[PDB]
Design a protein around this ligand. Sequence first.
Ligand SMILES: CO[C@H]1CN(c2ccc(C#C[C@@]3(O)CN4CCC3CC4)c(Cc3ccccc3)n2)C[C@H]1O
Lengths: 335, 335, 334, 332, 334, 335
Amino acid sequence: LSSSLKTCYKYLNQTSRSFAAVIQALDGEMRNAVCIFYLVLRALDTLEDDMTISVEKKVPLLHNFHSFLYQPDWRFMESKEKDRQVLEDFPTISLEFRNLAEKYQTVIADICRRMGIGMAEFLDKHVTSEQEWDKYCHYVAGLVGIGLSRLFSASEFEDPLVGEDTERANSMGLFLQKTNIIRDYLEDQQGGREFWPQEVWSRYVKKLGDFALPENIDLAVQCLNELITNALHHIPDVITYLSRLRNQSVFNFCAIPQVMAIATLAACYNNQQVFKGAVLIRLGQAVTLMMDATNMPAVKAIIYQYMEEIYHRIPDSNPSSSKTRQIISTIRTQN
Amino acid sequence: LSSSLKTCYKYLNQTSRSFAAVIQALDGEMRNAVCIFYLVLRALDTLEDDMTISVEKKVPLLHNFHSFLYQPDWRFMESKEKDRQVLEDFPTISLEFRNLAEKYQTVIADICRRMGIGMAEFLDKHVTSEQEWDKYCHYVAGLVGIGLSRLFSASEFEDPLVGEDTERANSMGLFLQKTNIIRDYLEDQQGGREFWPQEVWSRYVKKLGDFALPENIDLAVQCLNELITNALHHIPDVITYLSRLRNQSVFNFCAIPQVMAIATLAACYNNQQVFKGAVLIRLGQAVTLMMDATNMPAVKAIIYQYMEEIYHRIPDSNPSSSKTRQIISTIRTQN
Amino acid sequence: LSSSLKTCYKYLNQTSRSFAAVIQALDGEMRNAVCIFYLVLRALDTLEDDMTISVEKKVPLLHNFHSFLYQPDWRFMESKEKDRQVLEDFPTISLEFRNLAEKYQTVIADICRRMGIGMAEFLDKHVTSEQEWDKYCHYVAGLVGIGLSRLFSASEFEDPLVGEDTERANSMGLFLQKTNIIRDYLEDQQGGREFWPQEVWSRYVKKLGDFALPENIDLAVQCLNELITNALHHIPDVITYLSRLRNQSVFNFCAIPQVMAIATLAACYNNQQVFKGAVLIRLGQAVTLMMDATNMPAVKAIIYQYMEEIYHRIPDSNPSSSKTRQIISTIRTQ
Amino acid sequence: SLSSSLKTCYKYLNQTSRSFAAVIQALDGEMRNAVCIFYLVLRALDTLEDDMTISVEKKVPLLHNFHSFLYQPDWRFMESKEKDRQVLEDFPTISLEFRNLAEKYQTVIADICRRMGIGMAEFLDKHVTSEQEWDKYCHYVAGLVGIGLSRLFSASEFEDPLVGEDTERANSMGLFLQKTNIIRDYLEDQQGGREFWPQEVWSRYVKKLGDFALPENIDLAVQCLNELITNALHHIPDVITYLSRLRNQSVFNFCAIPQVMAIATLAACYNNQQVFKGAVLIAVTLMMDATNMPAVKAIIYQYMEEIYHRIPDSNPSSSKTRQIISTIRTQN
Amino acid sequence: LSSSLKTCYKYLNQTSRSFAAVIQALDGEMRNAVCIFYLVLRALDTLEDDMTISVEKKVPLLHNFHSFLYQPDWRFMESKEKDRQVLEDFPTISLEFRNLAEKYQTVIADICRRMGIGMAEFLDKHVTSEQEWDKYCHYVAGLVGIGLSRLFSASEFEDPLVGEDTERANSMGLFLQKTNIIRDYLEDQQGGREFWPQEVWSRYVKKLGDFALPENIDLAVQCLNELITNALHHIPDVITYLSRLRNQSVFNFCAIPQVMAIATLAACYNNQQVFKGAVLIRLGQAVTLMMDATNMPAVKAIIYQYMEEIYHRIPDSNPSSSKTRQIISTIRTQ
Amino acid sequence: LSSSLKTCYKYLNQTSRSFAAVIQALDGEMRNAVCIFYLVLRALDTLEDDMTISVEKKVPLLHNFHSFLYQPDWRFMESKEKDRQVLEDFPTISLEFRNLAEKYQTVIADICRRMGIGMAEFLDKHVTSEQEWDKYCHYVAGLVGIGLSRLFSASEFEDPLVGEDTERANSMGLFLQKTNIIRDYLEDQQGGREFWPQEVWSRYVKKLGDFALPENIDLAVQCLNELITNALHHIPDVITYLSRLRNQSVFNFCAIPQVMAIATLAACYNNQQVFKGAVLIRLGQAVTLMMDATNMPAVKAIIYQYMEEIYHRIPDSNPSSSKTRQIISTIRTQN
Ligand SMILES: CO[C@H]1CN(c2ccc(C#C[C@@]3(O)CN4CCC3CC4)c(Cc3ccccc3)n2)C[C@H]1O
């Protein structure tokens, strides 16, 4: 009934392309909790992205963002990004945050603190190792999967296990983040951002930006398949995690984005287009045509169908061909 | 093995484009009760539309139609309409009506009696105020939502509350009827039928027929968007009503047509093609692709997706622009 | 993390174009049990189809196939089939089979044995009568539907009532098989074998190969509608059988294949393309574009929409029209 | 408000039914009225069969056409002198509600009424002789009813299609109840001039069935009582199988409770001289009711042991009784 | 292991002869929420019944009782009633109240607030019409059935439709209350408390206390039967309300007390003993002892047997005979 | 249709007045396993209790009994007990023991082995401390609770937790055993056996037999209430144990005997009749009557009512009054 809450949801739909719909469809207290949660992370993320903010002035913000949640008057009017109104009109957001049950804000604020730490940390460096890729993805998405699970277990809509297995929840976050990192190479590159792991791309070319160069299209695709193969290893945890949910609204919120990500990886696999523009979500085969992602067995079938689309297009001489068949074979056989 | 019951279903399939399937999919008792309810209403509508029937002769028929249900031999042989078979062979349909449990009989007859009254009432006039629009929609559709709701409750497949809350039931009907009226502007025009509320279109043109003329397309679309905005006010009730359903076959029957109507309004909003012919139902955003309208959370997600599709296309100039944002905001925040 | 199990699933995906995913989606012990069940039946079918194997050497292999399951070192390297890797490497499959629980093994073996016997029977004869056509289908598909039902109950993921209803489980199989046969006419014509009952086509033309003759397209399409009408008679049992299920993974597994088959028949009905080439699962109505085969009410709606897509195309010319409408009518009032 | 005719039917149900009104009224949705009406028409038919003031010549056509009177709106019978005659004199009210039932239910009920009428007519001139004939008679008046009820459960979709298809198990449900009642109502019937115990059985004990009423034959009476009960016990395995297939709670309650009461009646009558002098009066159990399958099994097993340890070694059925009880005990 | 919570359950058992067991049997959070709810109502009721508290002092206590839940030190030490311990040690009870989740606190406080106003309203008067009887029963019990329903839904153990149906929840309360009021005629008369509606008993006697007079036994039993007939009218709602429940612990909690009340009315119907002391629930027709009140179909059967017990004892001469038959007919038929 | 298996069931019904029915009602594989388990224990108990079998002969019989299960022809023809038939025809029982799945054999044999040793350990002594009472009861009943639980988990009709939590399984047996020992005081006394713990009764009289003396009735009842109070301490575990069962047949089997034991204790509490003969079912209350022990909530309510029947009788002057109120209070407020 609130006017500020009405504003929060307006922002959610303003800044979110993939989650407003499933968030708003969440039952009870999760609706506003997840909604608010998304808004604070957006504002936080909007800070790390504004390069017009000196590193000397930005480190503080990231580190003490979790504290601005309790500062009714706090805000930021010195941002030029496109999602500024959430910082400028942050008071409206912080307000609703404080209207949440403590237990929920005890989770959201903890994550905001821990994320701000990781984000600041990677502020003056790029991802080198695959281990550091995980690490970075942990700070910006893995902790969100962890934070979301704890919110679910806290509302009691889901068993406490969900919130306890930070590992599985971590994978949920990593799979989405890696998928988007892979798919947005060109966009990120043209923006001056580099997220692909140097220890992986340096085996192909001198510098990451070279993949934007058409003469390197063959090497680029090869690196793409290696990165995708890497992300595929999280699928086992995704299935395990999804298979433990019992609340329908929570399952949709969780399953749908994951399936959309898997669908994106299948479309991007061995696809030169990843280096020319944006990629389009191929719906599944003739079987998936008759099924959606709202029940576990169907989500399984859909995933397996997307694996065969990848498996069937694997180039014999691709340097990762063996690795790709290995993980896919593991996904087919695991139960 | 009843030839008459078989004949009824043959008729159901010959006249119901979008309901035969979901109707025949209803569990047990509701199947025949809803099939027959559709057929009798179908016959009533056929009489109501037959312009070759003099008013003086049509009024008593609409008024007394409900009584023919109990007259074994009653039938109408002077109709030229396409679906005239349900009138010429009414004895077959009325016979099955009399075979339904008494509790379903009383609901259908009562609704038929009240609908006939309202249909005759609007035979000599057109819709003036937006209030008359609601009254007209109530008589030919709202009452149907209420009738169906009463059958669902009486069958025990759904809670007593579904049949009791007539306002929510009424909204289900108004939303479908308003959507179809908005969608079929042109077709009705080329038929001497005017359903758009006078007190609304008279603010853009002086002759409803003027919207078909393109010197006014810009005004016609303004009127179009206003009416759609009116119709959107029923969605909160539609969500509330669907949220109370617990029987899957009933949920399918109720939700699917509602979701299709919402998809339709989104495909007509600020769309010039409405005044040039038929419109198509673009799928639902990337997410929707993975969601069937067979569970409440999914239906919500879908409904929100469409709301944003409309919200994203609101011209700042459109005279209803702020009302359209207002209702959409109320729908997305309201839990 | 078993090596041989991973291989079985590699063959599952390899040989099956439409069951792999739904099989891998099955709950607990049904997963490997049905996968293995599909591979063995696959190997067995591979033999029957291989025409290089003599009529005297084939019969034995068919009759004893079920025993090979317990004979570790048993293999077969003298086949020219595209899916011979299952025969050549049968030990990998027999091993995992032997790793299944006793309850599952029993079922699978029994079906293989009975199927074997049946397949041998039609090695020298042909599909003459419709009753005969049911007989064959019962052997190559009907019994499989029963085996699956039994596995569901044995797994106890489904009520004991499922495995008991052998009559409708058999119908599940008969419907799919008659459908594949009807849709795969030309490919089977240009292949050497004919599965369409002579008693039915013999009343249309003198040779099944004659349907491939453009100068008979009419007679062709008419014989087509006639057979399809025959397959539609199984739908009531399919609906009843599916209505009984309570496990989501089992329902998806049973319902999606059946629905696709129905979509198939609706595409083939009164269609010439069944004789020139192969058909497309043309889109469904507007409503169906909303639902998917994962819950019974939705499966009913989808079925009804295909029945109407067919019914509205019935030409009152067809010697079958009367019968086509008759069964659909029955399907509508159930 | 709605149908006062239906209210009259439930009034008759409670008027004529001593043991089923409550569980029938408790059935879910459609089964409720269908089973109520089914009970009432059978009750009218039985009232005609049992009325001895109606000559056999006049009675046979009524029994043969009863199933058709269901479709004759004004038909009724005003010459019955039986205590339950109100259902015949006001049959129009009952057939009216019978005709308001969905057709799939009418079909089942009329069919059972038709077949039962034929069977009842067939037994008006003859007595029950062989055990095979005893089953036949029980099939007509009760076996077909179990079959009828089962077909209604499947037709309603509250139970699996199998329930109505397995006519043998459904038939056993009826026989067990009817044999039990026949065994328990020996005296009452003898005093009414009606004989139901198989002649080929009681003849091996006395010359005239009415002799068991005589104290000087009590020992022989009890021996016969035990042979019949022993016979009746053979239906239990089928009863258990039947109940174990039910999935609807209201249907389970309706089917099991009557069967348990009948089993409790046999246990109370076994080797009991009371069956021949007056009326018979019906510990782990007392913590359980007959509303879930495992509990029903337990209750049945307890009753079986009650009979088992009471079996007189001298009794000539002694071995037959132990064998069937052992068979029930070890049955899966 | 809270000592204060330990004390609350101790108080629950000291004051509730017929609810402690089913309350302690409730799943998860409903357990404490309903225990506390019972205790605070027990205190409020003791205040209402204490005739040593003047009306001008009592009105504020009743009106503001709900606010006392949030006053840690509030308590009442001037009561002479038998259950005054909950009032004298109210802080221990209000403490556990404040420990309950906010969603439960809100429902309990709201019902105390509303009940406080209703009780106060009736301090200066006796129940007159049957409409007034319903209003009074609504205030002291109807609101509790409504409150309990909201607690069930708030805990998620029950569907939200349960708390939403205030009409039937209200009937659940009126039924228990009217039954107790009927049963306790004598005990209330000897206590100087009159609850039987005046517009009803004044048609039989000059003073409600006259029913305690042996020479009016006949006019007393008739009034008794008229009140029971009135109470029977809530059974349809009771059955409807119970059919909606899905959680076993909640079902037992709601069904058992209703069934005991039904057994009580049957025992009291046309029973002279009502005016000479308490009445014994013995009851049980054939079927009964082979089924208890823990599943809906059984509950229905048990209720039907009790309705038949009453129906079979309805005297022709009784002024309510027709009405009594009508309502039971309605119960058994629909 | 095995003649040896039905002979086994004949013996079960012949030697078990209160478990034969619920055992026979057990689902699938549990049925035979539990039937056989009961028979072998019945045979073992028949040896232990036979006083015509010398200590010299008995010790080897109790210690090796478990091995006789594997010896096809082992039998014992010198028993003078009433149930000697199971010993003389042991090959029939052992044959069926060996036909059970190996996993069940492991359990049954293990328990017979452990029980054998425990019984042997007590042939030469009486029960002294309360710690020893627990030990004796563990050997003859607690181990059975553990064994039965392991059979349930092995069969998979119950979760592995049922079999793993041996402490709760042990409590189920101790409760029943302690209840039987309390109830059978007088019968055992006239039998020459003493089971009441000496460290408890000695604090009241010189010899256990003195409680049977009319002049010691007051002291006797006091002792009785102390032992009963002791037994009540297992109730929380009984509730915990039963609350975890998922299979209806297993629930009935475990719950009914437990509730019956609770009713017995309630009936014996502060009851002088315990020392003049036997006692029985204090028929419950008004709430009880309306509920059976086939669902957990109902079992809880039934148990709580009996706790109150006891609570209501605790006389302030009983030496154990405070201890009795304490454990009962603990039983009331534990979730
Ligand atoms: C409460 O939710 C329900 C509301 N629904 C409605 C509402 C109204 C109608 C209608 C209608 C008509 O009067 C309009 N027109 C077409 C059908 C009849 C006769 C002429 C219809 C059509 C209809 C369907 C089935 C039986 C009767 C009518 N459906 C279906 C669910 O969304």
